[PDB]
Amino acid sequence: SGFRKMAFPSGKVEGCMVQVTCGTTTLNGLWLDDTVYCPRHVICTAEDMLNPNYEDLLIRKSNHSFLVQAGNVQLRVIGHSMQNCLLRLKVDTSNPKTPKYKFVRIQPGQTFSVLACYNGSPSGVYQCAMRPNHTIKGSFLNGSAGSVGFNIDYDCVSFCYMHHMELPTGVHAGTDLEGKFYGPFVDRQTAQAAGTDTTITLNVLAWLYAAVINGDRWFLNRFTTTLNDFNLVAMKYNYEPLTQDHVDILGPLSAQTGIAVLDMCAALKELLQNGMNGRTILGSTILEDEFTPFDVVRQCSGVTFQ
Amino acid sequence: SGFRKMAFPSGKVEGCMVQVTCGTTTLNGLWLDDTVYCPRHVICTAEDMLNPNYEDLLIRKSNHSFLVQAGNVQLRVIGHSMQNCLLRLKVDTSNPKTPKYKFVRIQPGQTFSVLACYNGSPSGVYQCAMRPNHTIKGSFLNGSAGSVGFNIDYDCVSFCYMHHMELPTGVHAGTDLEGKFYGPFVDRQTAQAAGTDTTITLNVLAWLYAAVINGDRWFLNRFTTTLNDFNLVAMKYNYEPLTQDHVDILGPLSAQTGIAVLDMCAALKELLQNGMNGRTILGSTILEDEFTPFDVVRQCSGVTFQ
């Protein structure tokens, strides 16, 4: 019984992947019901990207200007239309494998499963988090745009992200399924760059509990800090604000390990004092920011004595 | 353009997981064509796994006392045929969802993906490597027995692990899909423990290769070491030796850069006797060993499936 950075079974999402090829551009598209979603820049060429006018461009393209194929059999496009940075294509046969779904907009800190695909087929699946700077540290290559990110709540695929491009530092930016980017990022070829990404406090703590849970509290002390004595030390360091909503959330882990969020945060200010080796924390010389409370709670189901 | 810990798409395997209740106990089974696979110890109640005669403990049990379930439909069982550490209770209809499969068996250092299930329902999927001490450091709460580990090689899911027991140390153990346990483990309460482990090395090595491809390089240089002096120090840091039968596979690896094998090896010497204190490799502080040369190419290359 150990911690693992897991992902939801990509099974359901795969039954929604297809290949959308336009011109000399081929990427991916999510096929839900009689609709097929793909990043709109599919209808562009390296040149168009310098100053794309998607509205006018898309106009120069009809229903069978987009060759979509579910596996080896191609689908019939019965109408095209634009929605922000996506492209809603209609089809003659709604997806018979469409599962209970829904579109959400994840926030920074939150995690999700990404099913990378190429030419409409799956390569692998991995987990990751929507960093505080609105970027993602996924693993994408050309032909990867069009891939989705999700979370499955009891037989329900909550789609939250759809890949597009890759930033200067090797990180990734994409949009929600409605078609709006997760940042100040525009899908055109202009000078852009990820803003200085910090660290997720809430998950750095979840990690901290997972640690205690599984052993080691050398980073613990009778040290008690206020809800404003930690947050000052916060902006100094990369770690973000520990709102009152994080407190509550850290509640369940709190009650379990018998430790108080305040005394936990206080244990952290002493890590921004060193926190070197000597005993480390589950190996990691640093601090894991992409393991959410829910995740730790999830894995390693412990009890709470009352 | 990043390098995450990837897992195989779990669609061709999820559609195989079913539930296999027997009395009060309940596991997850593998459903291929007509046959159904599952953990022998599914006929035991309470401290039965303390005193497992099995071959006799199954005699009294009958087909009916086997509730194979596919999420609703009951699968008429008919084949209380025990095979090694597994059962082989055939059912009436063959799994229509059955994929194209093999049952190959993995060796130390090799990797595979895991579809953790509970009550026959896929919970999460992840990737782990067959440790040398012959165990799989991973995550499995109760009711994880019956879970499965596989690999995908172009239109062919080859199964290679069936989760069974969990060691006291936290790590777990199971068997190939033939019943043959892995390492010298058994399934009772003989209070067995796992031996000392060494690093697959060939993975920690091949991990660097993908580090390079993603730019992140600051070790490619070093006192270009030998072929013996190196693995010598390995046993100075707990790393099993290496043979040319292990580098000749790294053919394409180097063939996709120009970076030597030996020189690369020297980066390690300087990586442990000195370390890296400060800068990191693709994020992690520790050196990752759960990444085979194929896993690294499989990712960096984009190899899809079907």
Side-chain angles (χ1 to χ4, degrees):
Chain A
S1 177
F3 293 79
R4 233 61 179 63
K5 197 162 283 187
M6 298 170 90
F8 288 69
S10 75
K12 280 166 183 47
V13 182
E14 298 176 27
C16 305
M17 301 313 309
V18 303
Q19 187 181 68
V20 196
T21 79
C22 189
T24 58
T25 321
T26 280
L27 41 62
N28 300 123
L30 198 58
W31 177 25
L32 292 175
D33 298 316
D34 72 296
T35 306
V36 167
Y37 310 70
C38 81
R40 69 174 177 173
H41 80 240
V42 59
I43 75 168
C44 281
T45 65
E47 278 269 53
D48 290 318
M49 303 318 279
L50 274 80
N51 181 176
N53 199 299
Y54 299 101
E55 187 194 62
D56 292 347
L57 296 172
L58 179 62
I59 285 176
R60 274 85 167 172
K61 294 220 160 56
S62 294
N63 288 183
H64 50 42
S65 307
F66 313 111
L67 178 57
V68 168
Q69 56 189 63
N72 299 173
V73 64
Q74 78 164 68
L75 297 182
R76 172 67 92 63
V77 189
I78 69 171
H80 57 289
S81 48
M82 184 150 75
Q83 164 170 44
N84 295 296
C85 295
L86 294 204
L87 225 177
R88 290 205 277 75
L89 303 163
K90 289 193 183 179
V91 292
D92 57 9
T93 38
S94 64
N95 193 320
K97 268 119 92 68
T98 311
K100 251 283 178 61
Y101 72 86
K102 73 181 298 188
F103 294 160
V104 321
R105 185 172 180 68
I106 42 69
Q107 260 69 196
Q110 279 166 51
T111 69
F112 59 72
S113 290
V114 176
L115 177 64
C117 290
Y118 289 100
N119 310 301
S121 292
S123 186
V125 60
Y126 53 93
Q127 183 104 315
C128 73
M130 172 58 83
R131 307 301 303 166
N133 73 341
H134 304 66
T135 62
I136 281 187
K137 299 180 182 169
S139 274
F140 299 99
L141 300 172
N142 296 190
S144 67
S147 301
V148 298
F150 61 108
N151 281 293
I152 300 171
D153 43 309
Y154 246 121
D155 310 330
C156 187
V157 188
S158 293
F159 290 112
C160 64
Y161 176 81
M162 175 178 257
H163 192 47
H164 267 63
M165 58 192 251
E166 183 180 305
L167 292 177
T169 75
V171 301
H172 308 70
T175 67
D176 56 30
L177 266 301
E178 280 204 354
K180 302 286 285 89
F181 270 77
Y182 278 111
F185 313 121
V186 289
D187 61 319
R188 82 168 180 180
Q189 180 57 268
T190 32
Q192 287 171 287
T196 23
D197 180 50
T198 68
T199 268
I200 308 97
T201 55
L202 184 46
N203 313 324
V204 169
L205 292 199
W207 199 58
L208 290 181
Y209 279 81
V212 178
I213 290 175
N214 198 290
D216 280 304
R217 309 166 306 301
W218 57 258
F219 58 75
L220 258 154
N221 258 185
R222 76 198 90 288
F223 286 173
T224 169
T225 176
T226 70
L227 308 71
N228 303 152
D229 189 30
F230 174 70
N231 279 163
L232 289 185
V233 192
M235 72 190 76
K236 192 183 194 309
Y237 298 93
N238 313 291
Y239 300 53
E240 41 194 59
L242 175 69
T243 67
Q244 182 61 191
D245 192 300
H246 307 317
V247 177
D248 178 32
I249 293 178
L250 278 164
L253 285 182
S254 176
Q256 194 193 301
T257 56
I259 298 183
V261 178
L262 285 181
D263 295 275
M264 187 58 96
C265 296
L268 186 167
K269 194 280 159 284
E270 286 296 347
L271 297 167
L272 317 186
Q273 146 73 191
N274 192 64
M276 288 304 270
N277 195 298
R279 190 53 191 173
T280 63
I281 300 84
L282 281 282
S284 186
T285 295
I286 46 179
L287 295 180
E288 185 57 68
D289 44 18
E290 301 193 2
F291 217 23
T292 57
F294 174 126
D295 279 311
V296 171
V297 182
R298 179 194 179 185
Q299 291 173 48
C300 88
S301 71
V303 298
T304 318
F305 298 101
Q306 303 182 290
Chain B
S1 175
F3 199 79
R4 292 274 199 183
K5 184 70 90 78
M6 211 125 129
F8 281 107
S10 58
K12 310 184 191 305
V13 172
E14 274 169 60
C16 275
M17 303 321 277
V18 298
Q19 171 169 44
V20 173
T21 311
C22 174
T24 22
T25 92
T26 305
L27 304 181
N28 309 279
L30 183 56
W31 184 17
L32 299 171
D33 292 284
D34 61 44
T35 320
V36 193
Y37 302 85
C38 81
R40 195 201 317 177
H41 68 281
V42 58
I43 55 180
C44 308
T45 298
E47 314 109 307
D48 288 12
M49 291 75 98
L50 178 76
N51 297 58
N53 185 303
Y54 292 154
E55 298 196 68
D56 167 296
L57 191 47
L58 117 170
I59 302 173
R60 265 172 278 293
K61 287 63 179 179
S62 290
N63 280 31
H64 277 69
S65 185
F66 280 122
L67 250 184
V68 190
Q69 307 176 59
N72 42 47
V73 184
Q74 146 66 297
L75 294 191
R76 298 176 62 169
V77 62
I78 20 184
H80 50 48
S81 60
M82 185 188 109
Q83 211 286 220
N84 275 307
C85 296
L86 293 50
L87 279 185
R88 272 186 55 78
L89 42 156
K90 301 181 175 53
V91 295
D92 64 62
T93 44
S94 71
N95 183 193
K97 315 289 282 292
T98 294
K100 180 161 172 297
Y101 65 100
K102 301 200 303 175
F103 273 3
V104 303
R105 168 164 162 139
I106 53 77
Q107 272 291 80
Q110 178 75 299
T111 56
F112 66 84
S113 312
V114 177
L115 178 53
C117 301
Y118 296 87
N119 294 58
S121 62
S123 178
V125 57
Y126 63 75
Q127 186 122 335
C128 76
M130 172 50 66
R131 303 310 302 182
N133 63 42
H134 296 289
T135 61
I136 285 69
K137 53 176 66 179
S139 33
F140 299 101
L141 292 177
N142 198 239
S144 64
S147 291
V148 68
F150 59 100
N151 283 295
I152 309 183
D153 177 1
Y154 278 89
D155 198 11
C156 171
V157 188
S158 34
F159 294 104
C160 79
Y161 187 85
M162 166 81 74
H163 186 56
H164 278 144
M165 307 306 261
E166 175 188 305
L167 283 305
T169 153
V171 294
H172 334 59
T175 64
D176 68 316
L177 281 297
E178 204 189 307
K180 295 170 57 59
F181 241 82
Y182 268 116
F185 297 103
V186 299
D187 61 304
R188 324 181 72 248
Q189 186 80 179
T190 53
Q192 55 267 257
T196 59
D197 202 69
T198 51
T199 288
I200 305 74
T201 299
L202 184 72
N203 292 332
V204 168
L205 293 168
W207 176 55
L208 309 167
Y209 257 108
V212 169
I213 304 177
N214 293 216
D216 185 51
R217 69 178 75 181
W218 63 296
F219 44 57
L220 185 43
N221 196 293
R222 222 284 161 165
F223 279 113
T224 163
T225 182
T226 67
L227 34 53
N228 187 307
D229 299 58
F230 175 52
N231 47 59
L232 176 166
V233 178
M235 306 315 271
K236 178 164 290 61
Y237 287 118
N238 176 60
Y239 287 43
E240 177 187 357
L242 51 71
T243 91
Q244 240 46 52
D245 295 351
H246 278 48
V247 183
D248 293 294
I249 40 187
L250 298 189
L253 280 306
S254 185
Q256 280 191 65
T257 21
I259 64 180
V261 178
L262 307 179
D263 287 65
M264 178 57 100
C265 302
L268 295 71
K269 188 184 296 179
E270 179 201 299
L271 269 179
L272 307 180
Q273 83 203 318
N274 305 311
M276 50 180 256
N277 297 56
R279 297 183 68 185
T280 63
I281 309 179
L282 294 177
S284 168
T285 67
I286 336 169
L287 283 88
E288 249 300 353
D289 38 335
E290 287 185 7
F291 278 123
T292 66
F294 176 36
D295 282 335
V296 167
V297 186
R298 174 269 289 227
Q299 240 213 80
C300 299
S301 201
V303 300
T304 87
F305 300 104
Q306 173 57 66

